[PDB]
């Protein structure tokens, strides 16, 4: 009941009240996937994730250089995790929900997607299934995405003191909440951390899919995810 205050403050920052979807700007007998538009949609989602991060406690106090490093470290993880949590909210094994409200059957991606994309999607759905079995909730969701945001080793930043505090306070918050709210079997704190390891592994496969598209000149010319890929991580 006594939800940690960090988690409370993070829910208040969470923009979703239908507003993310409205704000997303690709401007609106079945057919091939709308590739360019799907790209656009993902780019705008990245935009909204940076909007989120710049409003976050701790982060908004850091100087721009540190903010950039942190986001350079985690951008693909945040996007994958964004997509994953959308799928736990969806609660359908047979299709994927997109931020636009559009659902894509998994049979569709089986017929159209190449080797790489298909693997990626499927591996992601396994992770969705895992988080559903852990009864993942919105409180845990926002805590976990703050954790991902600050999942960079201190040494890479100017401001150690504040980032260390955020890293420590965020984990403590997750433990406290899972311990109080999931009095069930399994250490849920630890299981969720294991999930984050998988989110990171997925996001690596995602960048490699991206890099594949880029080398074959298949991406839109001014794609934001490609610009993020190409800037020194």
């Amino acid at each position: 009941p006594n939800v940690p205050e960090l988690i409370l403050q993070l829910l208040q920052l969470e923009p979703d009240e239908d507003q993310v979807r409205a704000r997303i700007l690709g401007s609106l007998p079945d057919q091939p996937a709308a590739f360019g538009l799907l790209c656009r949609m993902a780019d705008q989602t990245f935009i909204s994730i940076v909007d989120w991060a710049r409003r976050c406690m701790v982060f908004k106090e850091l100087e721009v250089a540190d903010q950039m490093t942190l986001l350079q470290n985690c951008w693909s993880e945040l996007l994958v995790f964004d997509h994953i949590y959308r799928q736990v909210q969806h609660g359908k094994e047979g299709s994927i929900l997109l931020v636009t409200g559009q659902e894509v059957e998994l049979t569709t991606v089986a017929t159209q997607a190449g080797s790489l994309l298909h693997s990626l999607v499927l591996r992601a759905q396994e992770l969705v299934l895992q988080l559903l079995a852990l009864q993942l909730d919105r409180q845990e969701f926002v805590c976990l995405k703050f954790i991902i945001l600050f999942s960079l080793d201190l040494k890479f930043l100017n401001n150690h003191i504040l980032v260390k505090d955020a890293q420590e306070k965020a984990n403590a918050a997750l433990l406290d909440y899972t311990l109080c709210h999931y009095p069930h079997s399994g250490d849920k704190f630890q299981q969720l951390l294991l999930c984050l390891v998988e989110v990171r592994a997925l996001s690596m496969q995602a960048k490699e899919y991206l890099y594949h598209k880029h080398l074959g000149n298949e991406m839109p010319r001014n794609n934001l995810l490609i610009e993020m890929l190409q800037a020194k991580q």
């Binding site: 950039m68 350079q72 993020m228």
Partner: peptide, 12 residues
Amino acid sequence: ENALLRYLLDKD
């Protein structure tokens, strides 16, 4: 340094 990240963090 990432010109896009600076832009999105400075403004848009």
